[PDB]
Amino acid sequence: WAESLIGLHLGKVALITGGSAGIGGQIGRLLALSGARVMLAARDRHKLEQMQAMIQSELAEVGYTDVEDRVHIAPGCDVSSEAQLADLVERTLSAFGTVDYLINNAGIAGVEEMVIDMPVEGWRHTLFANLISNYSLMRKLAPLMKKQGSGYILNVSSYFGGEKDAAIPYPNRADYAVSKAGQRAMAEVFARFLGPEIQINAIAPGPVEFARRARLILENKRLNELHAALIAAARTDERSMHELVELLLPNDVAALEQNPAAPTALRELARRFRSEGDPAASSSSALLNRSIAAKLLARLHNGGYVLPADIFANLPNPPDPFFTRAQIDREARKVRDGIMGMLYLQRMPTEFDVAMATVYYLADRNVSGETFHPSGGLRYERTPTGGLFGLPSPERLAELVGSTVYLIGEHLTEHLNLLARAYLERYGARQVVMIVETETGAETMRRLLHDHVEAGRLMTIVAGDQIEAAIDQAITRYGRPGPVVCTPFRPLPTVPLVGRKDSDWSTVLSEAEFAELCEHQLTHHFRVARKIALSDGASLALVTPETTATSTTEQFALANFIKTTLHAFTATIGVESERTAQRILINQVDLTRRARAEEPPHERQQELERFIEAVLLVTAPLPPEADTRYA
Amino acid sequence: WAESLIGLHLGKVALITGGSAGIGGQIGRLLALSGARVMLAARDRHKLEQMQAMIQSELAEVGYTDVEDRVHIAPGCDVSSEAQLADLVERTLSAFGTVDYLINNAGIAGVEEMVIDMPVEGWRHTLFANLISNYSLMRKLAPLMKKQGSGYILNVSSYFGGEKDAAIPYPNRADYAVSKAGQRAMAEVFARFLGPEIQINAIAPGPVEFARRARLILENKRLNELHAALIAAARTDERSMHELVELLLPNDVAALEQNPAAPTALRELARRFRSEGDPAASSSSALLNRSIAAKLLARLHNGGYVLPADIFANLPNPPDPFFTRAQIDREARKVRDGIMGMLYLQRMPTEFDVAMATVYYLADRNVSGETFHPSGGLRYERTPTGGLFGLPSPERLAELVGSTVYLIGEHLTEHLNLLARAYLERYGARQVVMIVETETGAETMRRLLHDHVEAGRLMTIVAGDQIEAAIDQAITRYGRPGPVVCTPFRPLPTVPLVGRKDSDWSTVLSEAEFAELCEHQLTHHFRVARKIALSDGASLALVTPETTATSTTEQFALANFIKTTLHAFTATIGVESERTAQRILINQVDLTRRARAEEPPHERQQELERFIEAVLLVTAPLPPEADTRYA
């Protein structure tokens, strides 16, 4: 079966991260059979050694000699560590000389939580492991590729990283989805710079070849239903969140339902628990357990709600089982049937087959900037990214009277000034809280908005790199937001994206600068979305970098990289929020365009008004339902 | 070099249309080397025989025996003819038994004109040759594939057929672009029905490996500039189009520029010809030649303008050269440099290389509904298809007072009623001309709109299958349109899209019914767009079929097929119109959605209002420029 492969990649040197198992192991195996010398990098030494021994044995079977020279390993390699990536490249070049194929295959599942349960450092770790590592190894290996005249970079992405002009939501997986989309976007925007010498493509396989995860889903559902009901009740109830949570302390579903003084949101939730609950499960008669309570308390504390850390210290523990085996097995079959039901071909691909298709694809010298699907044929949700638009309804705009608006930004002073004035002057917002990065940014906005500052309608807060603490200041001092608009603090850098063939690339976008780019243009939005969703914001517009007719070709590339990658975040958290009955509406407003000629004197003011209308379209709330006694 | 290939497809039977040359010939060649028995179909017998002889010789070289049994040909095969497709399938099954791989490769370039110069029968011929042929061969070969448990359909599409969620404009090639997009859309929507037994995918290669075409471009540019200026002048000049064309009869650029009584549009055009013209070319001193005049006369006659057929009979002939060799060679280099400048890899792929990548791809058993790019890495324009939107500006809506609106449809009576009322009652349109297919449709709309009928604001015309003649009736009797809205006359069919494994497929969507689908859901819109652009309509909304919660799964599939395929048309004619300085704004409004659960009692009226707003957004004209003496 290896006859088609032998010789296909003879004389190539390949580095495969995550090479000890899964798709990466099979790509390493089949590249070796096809004649390439391979360096397999992974964290676990023992698994790598077994893989290396298996491959070398198979090479000897089909006639290669000196097989120890053809398959090397790099154990203990954590691709999230920049120092270890340098060590890996040094080890590889010492073994084999120049690398022909960089197979960026390593990937961690990530935090596996909803955004509002996702620690910021956990999100960052996923980005370093799954996305920044890919840029870093390219940055270390592309100079030698370009010098020798040929090279190939393959980022092993995922179907759940989306496609060129559409985003794919991956609820409870926003960090993973963003890193996958970033892998594809890196190929899309770096191809023109890396050509003609170097090809760069992504592969995005679909599903490839349990009770514990199902129980977690049910525990998460209980958490979401409680959190949404408490957030909603605190919105329209005179009682504090502290007083509302005290209603849950008896941990008695029927008693809460029957409490005439409990808010309707909580009473109706208790009725649902009793009706939809399995009578053999204690979740049908108890509101929560200690694990759910602690996670709920963290959500509330992370949303700026004030309540004692020991409020659940005397919570009665429901007896096992909280969910029955029947409930858990039912959810597990639902998960499995959902995944199987995606497959047009009704059969799960193997890792071997996906690797074989990838190894054939690597022979194709005429593709760059593409995302190849070695398996696919999937019925799954899809959100085409952006377009023509208009203004929202007059009744939705009338809902902005008296609102509290947060605006976040620094560099886009003209946008921030106009947006503040539109909310305040056109739609009678009560106040605008302007959250900037630095004192210099604060003074700039205060001068641009001096009239509204002097009248108490424009407040400024300096966030620095502590945006969550700044939002807590806004919550405490000025009240929770309705609309929030989040723009990046920083402009895009202007450094080269590739080096000249005979240069040392010393001025090219560094590994650290790429990480800084992700921090200011992706993580910035995730932190705001996380905090604002937790803090009961009504709507949130995420704004991507601006490009103008004077932007450089590299800035256009990076803007489109950010636009594509952020659309995966926006799509995912949108579906997460909808499916969990959070009310917050999260949307993305793009300021950039792919080509320079598409940029706007008069067209400038027209472009700024279009931005204003797009933001109003996604931040103007719906009017409440009418009083049924009269209308 | 064939070592990787031998055995890869051993025992497969493949039918390749367009198999005598180009990519199809190389796919046939490499499939044969890989062990498949191949039937090569093409029109020219001699070229096919040479290809067959070359392949058989190569098979004998690498060790196959009885090579005449491995490579057959089907000469004189015109895939645009349904009868010849039946003959081809009978010939193939007689030779080889069941076909494993259908390689739908045949394709003609098509009409190679702008939509407004494109004969309707020429458009239809391209659809039959390039798109309907693909369905017809699938319909004849899929039953045997499903019966034996395996099969593969590959539609050889093009990069200029777009991608899953974005359209790619191909000006002067709308018929080709639509057929290419339809090939991809057929794979996308039929995959779920054809699985698990049958895979269906498309390939969309980019450019693969002149003075005459450049001269045609320059002649077309002269045509476009004259036509746009005449159309514009007739709009605001008291003189008839007949009288305006008489100003061109001296065929003297300088005299027209200097004529104080000539409309400013024509005087400024003549100045441009003199300034931008090569003084050694007679196009700098003569307005047109007899070839351009005849094509211009056809445009005007096809737009309902009245002027004698012999109006250019005494036109002075400009001496050669009309365009200089320098001008022609300059345009030729511009065309070439444009295509080369697309390639990220700065090198043109060969037909052999694209075929090799396709033959490797055919081994992948885990992909269906995909579009594989065997070459790619292209910097080219892209229009992401659809989304959130709003209402247009109040000043744009005020421009609708006194307008003449055409509405075209029959089945969507509720949409047509509401749209007519919105234009008439909300925005003070002067009149609405309702163009339906049948008398029964006319009486239905007349009853729904009886108040506006009785008041002279709603006129009805019955078009049958002669929509162009019906529009001429509207032009003559009621005046030229501003906004036009074009909806399909017919609903989508409800027949099965595949048959049961042991059935004869007698109820499955027939080849004729697929052609009828294209006529009513694609050609219908092309004919209207062509006629309305020629007739100086100000805007045109193309509306795709409606789906509701009661639509069948097959109707959802066909609606998305039409939506994807029509977006290629809309994108192409949009860019064509913009690049040639036509003022007409053409956009697409989609009524369907991919999934059934995404369909709307109350949500129904909300969905209809959204449709109204989308149509107003693309049909409300811009206000004119203000009088500079005062503002």
Asked if A571 and A564 count as a contact pair (C-beta separation under 8 A), the reply is no
B423 annotated among ligand-binding-site residues: no
Both B68 and B35 in one domain: the answer is: yes
Residue A47 lies in a domain: yes
Q: What are phi and psi of B168, to 5 degrees?
A: -120, 110
From CA A33, how far away is CA A469, in angstroms rounded? 55
Both A272 and A197 in one domain: the answer is: no
Both B446 and B377 in one domain: the answer is: no
**How far is C-alpha A197 from the geometric centre of its chain's CA atoms?**
32
From CA B303, how far away is CA B308, in angstroms rounded? 14
Residue B441 half-sphere exposure toward CB, CA atoms < 13 A: 22
Kindly tell me the burial class for residue B452, based on how many C-beta atoms sit within 10 Å of its own C-beta (0-12, 13-18, 19 or more). buried
From CA B620, how far away is CA A194, in angstroms rounded? 45
Long-range contacts of B255-264 (CB under 8 A, 24+ apart): B256/B287, B263/B233, B263/B236, B263/B237, B263/B239
Kindly tell me the burial class for residue B610, based on how many C-beta atoms sit within 10 Å of its own C-beta (0-12, 13-18, 19 or more). middle
Contact criterion met (CB < 8 Å) for A370 and B361: no
Work out how many CB contacts closer than 8 A connect A with B.
187
C-alpha triplet A502, A505, A506: angle, nearest 5°: 130
**CB-CB neighbours of B437 under 10 Å:** 22
B563 CB contacts (<8 Å, ≥6 apart)? B385, B544, B545, B590, B592
Asked if A426 and A546 count as a contact pair (C-beta separation under 8 A), the reply is no
What is residue A284's DSSP assignment? G
Both A496 and A603 in one domain: the answer is: yes
The DSSP element (H or E) to which A232 belongs, if any, is: helix A211-236
B261 CB contacts (<8 Å, ≥6 apart)? none
Using DSSP's 3-state secondary structure scheme, residue A79 falls into coil
Both B205 and B216 in one domain: the answer is: no
Residue B517 lies in a domain: yes
Using DSSP's 3-state secondary structure scheme, residue A458 falls into strand
From CA A36, how far away is CA A22, in angstroms rounded? 19
Contact criterion met (CB < 8 Å) for B360 and A363: yes
From CA A366, how far away is CA B357, in angstroms rounded? 9
Interface of A with B in 382-441 (CB under 8 A): 382, 384-393
From CA B281, how far away is CA B290, in angstroms rounded? 16
C-alpha triplet A74, A75, A77: angle, nearest 5°: 85
Q: What domain range includes position A347?
A: 13-209+342-382
Contact criterion met (CB < 8 Å) for A366 and B372: no
B237 annotated among ligand-binding-site residues: yes
Asked if B105 and B19 count as a contact pair (C-beta separation under 8 A), the reply is yes
B44 annotated among ligand-binding-site residues: yes
Both A371 and A411 in one domain: the answer is: no
Interface of B with A in 365-384 (CB under 8 A): 365-370, 372-377, 379, 381-382, 384
The count of structural domains within chain A is 3
* Chain B residues in contact with A6 (beta carbon < 8 A): 3
Both B271 and B366 in one domain: the answer is: no
Q: What are phi and psi of A407, to 5 degrees?
A: -120, 135
Contact criterion met (CB < 8 Å) for B368 and A389: no
CA quadruple A253, A259, A262, A268: dihedral positive or negative? positive
Using DSSP's 3-state secondary structure scheme, residue A274 falls into helix
The DSSP element (H or E) to which A14 belongs, if any, is: strand A13-17
Asked if B59 and B89 count as a contact pair (C-beta separation under 8 A), the reply is no
Q: Output the DSSP codes for B114-172.
A: -GGG--HHHHHHHHIIIIIHHHHHHHHHHHHHHHHT-EEEEEE--GGG-BTTEE---TT
B611 CB contacts (<8 Å, ≥6 apart)? B415, B418, B589, B591
β-sheet bridge partners, residue A16: A40, A103
From CA A491, how far away is CA A497, in angstroms rounded? 16
Q: Output the DSSP codes for A164-219.
A: TTEE---TT-HHHHHHHHHHHHHHHHHHHHHTTTEEEEEE-------HHHHHHHHH
Residue A561 lies in a domain: yes
Residue holding tokens 């032998």? A6
From CA A366, how far away is CA A152, in angstroms rounded? 11
From CA A625, how far away is CA B175, in angstroms rounded? 50
Nearest neighbour of B366 by CB, restricted to A7, A345, A367: A345
Interface of B with A in 148-167 (CB under 8 A): 163-166
Asked if A345 and B195 count as a contact pair (C-beta separation under 8 A), the reply is yes
Of B383, B577, B222, B30, whose CA–CA distance to A388 is shortest? B383
Using DSSP's 3-state secondary structure scheme, residue A311 falls into coil
Q: What is the CA radius of gyration of chain A?
A: 27
Residue holding tokens 């028995």? B37
Q: Which chain A residue has its CA at the smallest distance from B386's CA? A: A387
Q: What are phi and psi of A249, to 5 degrees?
A: -65, -35
Q: Say what angle helices A174-194 and A120-127 make with each other, to 10 degrees.
A: 30
| Whole-number Cα distances in Å, A418 to A251, A481, A592, A615 | 50, 19, 18, 11
A275 CB contacts (<8 Å, ≥6 apart)? none
Of A182, A75, A101, A88, whose CA–CA distance to A135 is shortest? A182
Q: Output the DSSP codes for A82-139.
A: HHHHHHHHHHHHHHHSS-SEEEE--------S-GGG--HHHHHHHHIIIIIHHHHHHH
Strand order in the sheet with A458-462: A458-462, A431-436, A404-408, A483-486, A539-543, A585-589
Which stretches within A22-81 are classed as H helix? 22-33, 45-61
Judge whether A360 is closer than 8 Å to chain B, CB to CB.
yes
* B166-167 and B383-384 strand pairing: antiparallel
B503 CB contacts (<8 Å, ≥6 apart)? B143
Q: Give residue numbers after which chain A breaks (C–N above 2.5 Å).
A: 209, 387, 600
From CA A74, how far away is CA A89, in angstroms rounded? 10
Residue A285 lies in a domain: yes
How far A353 CA sits from the closest chain B CA (Å)? 8
List the structure tokens of B433.
């001309």
Residue A387 lies in a domain: no
Nearest neighbour of A192 by CB, restricted to B6, B195, B379: B379
Both A170 and A248 in one domain: the answer is: no
Buried b (16+ CB within 10 A) or exposed e, A441-464: bbebbbebbeebbeeebbbbbbbe
Kindly tell me the burial class for residue B552, based on how many C-beta atoms sit within 10 Å of its own C-beta (0-12, 13-18, 19 or more). middle
* A166-167 and A383-384 strand pairing: antiparallel
Buried b (16+ CB within 10 A) or exposed e, B410-423: bbbbebbbbbbbbb
From CA A570, how far away is CA B583, in angstroms rounded? 36
Nearest neighbour of B8 by CB, restricted to A4, A196, A385: A4
Asked if B446 and B509 count as a contact pair (C-beta separation under 8 A), the reply is no
Judge whether A589 is closer than 8 Å to chain B, CB to CB.
no
Q: Which chain B residue has its CA at the smallest distance from A199's CA? A: B345
Best B30, B364, B497, B616 residue to mutate vs chain A (most A CBs within 10 Å): B364
From CA B449, how far away is CA B431, in angstroms rounded? 12
Interface of A with B in 44-103 (CB under 8 A): none
**How far is C-alpha A507 from the geometric centre of its chain's CA atoms?**
29
| Whole-number Cα distances in Å, B438 to B405, B413, B418 | 20, 13, 20
Both A569 and A432 in one domain: the answer is: yes
Asked if B42 and A38 count as a contact pair (C-beta separation under 8 A), the reply is no
Both A193 and A223 in one domain: the answer is: no
How far B547 CA sits from the closest chain A CA (Å)? 18
From CA A543, how far away is CA A110, in angstroms rounded? 25
**How far is C-alpha B603 from the geometric centre of its chain's CA atoms?**
33
B502 CB contacts (<8 Å, ≥6 apart)? B147
Of how many residues is chain A composed?
A: 631
List the structure tokens of A78.
């954590």
Asked if A110 and A130 count as a contact pair (C-beta separation under 8 A), the reply is yes
Nearest neighbour of B344 by CB, restricted to A191, A377, A617: A191
β-sheet bridge partners, residue B378: B343
Nearest neighbour of B377 by CB, restricted to A367, A386, A594: A367
Nearest neighbour of B388 by CB, restricted to A346, A381, A389: A389
C-alpha triplet B421, B425, B431: angle, nearest 5°: 75
* B13-17 and B101-104 strand pairing: parallel
Nearest neighbour of B390 by CB, restricted to A195, A385, A391: A391
How far B127 CA sits from the closest chain A CA (Å)? 26
Task: For chain B, report the end-to-end CA distance as a whole number of angstroms.
Answer: 74
From CA A364, how far away is CA A374, in angstroms rounded? 14
Method: X-ray
Q: Say what angle helices B45-61 and B22-33 make with each other, to 10 degrees.
A: 30
A23 CB contacts (<8 Å, ≥6 apart)? A105, A156, A205, A208, A351, A354, A355, A358
A81 CB contacts (<8 Å, ≥6 apart)? A128
Resolution of the experimental model in angstroms, please?
1.8
Judge whether B363 is closer than 8 Å to chain A, CB to CB.
yes
Nearest neighbour of B166 by CB, restricted to A165, A347, A373: A165
Which of residues A330, A354, A373 is at a domain's end? A330
From CA A420, how far away is CA A433, in angstroms rounded? 9
How far A373 CA sits from the closest chain B CA (Å)? 8
Residue A337 lies in a domain: no
Of A252, A255, A145, A139, whose CA–CA distance to A506 is shortest? A139
Q: Output the DSSP codes for A370-437.
A: -EE-SS--B----EE------BPPHHHHHTTTT-EEEEE-SS-HHHHHHHHHIIIIIT--SEEEEEES
**CB-CB neighbours of B625 under 10 Å:** 7
Contact criterion met (CB < 8 Å) for A346 and B195: yes
Contact criterion met (CB < 8 Å) for A374 and B367: yes
Q: Does A321 sit behind a cis peptide bond, omega within 30 degrees of 0 on the bond before it?
A: yes
* Chain A residues in contact with B393 (beta carbon < 8 A): 390-391
Both B372 and B409 in one domain: the answer is: no
What is residue B369's DSSP assignment? S
Nearest neighbour of B390 by CB, restricted to A192, A372, A389: A389
Task: Report the binding-site residues of A for NADP(+).
Answer: 18, 20-21, 23, 43-44, 47, 78-79, 105, 176, 180, 208
Asked if A327 and A277 count as a contact pair (C-beta separation under 8 A), the reply is no
List the structure tokens of A347.
């059969």
Of B538, B518, B529, whose CA–CA distance to B582 is shortest? B538
Contact criterion met (CB < 8 Å) for B377 and A361: no
β-sheet bridge partners, residue B197: none
**How far is C-alpha A486 from the geometric centre of its chain's CA atoms?**
16
From CA A491, how far away is CA A510, in angstroms rounded? 17
Task: Report the binding-site residues of A for Mg(2+).
Answer: 234, 237, 547, 577, 582, 599, 607
Domain containing residue A87: CATH number:
3.40.50.720
Using DSSP's 3-state secondary structure scheme, residue B30 falls into helix
Long-range contacts of B415-420 (CB under 8 A, 24+ apart): B415/B487, B415/B543, B415/B546, B415/B591, B415/B608, B415/B611, B416/B445, B416/B448, B416/B487, B417/B445, B417/B448, B417/B449, B418/B608, B418/B611, B418/B612, B419/B485, B419/B612, B419/B615, B420/B445, B420/B449, B420/B452, B420/B458
Residue B336 lies in a domain: no
From CA A6, how far away is CA A137, in angstroms rounded? 28
Of A250, A284, A245, A281, whose CA–CA distance to A266 is shortest? A245
Residue A336 lies in a domain: no
Of A35, A38, A36, whose CA–CA distance to A48 is shortest? A38
Give the type of residue at B434.
M
Both B131 and B234 in one domain: the answer is: no
Judge whether A169 is closer than 8 Å to chain B, CB to CB.
no
Of A541, A585, A394, whose CA–CA distance to B390 is shortest? A394
Q: Which chain B residue has its CA at the smallest distance from A372's CA? A: B372
Contact criterion met (CB < 8 Å) for B346 and A384: no
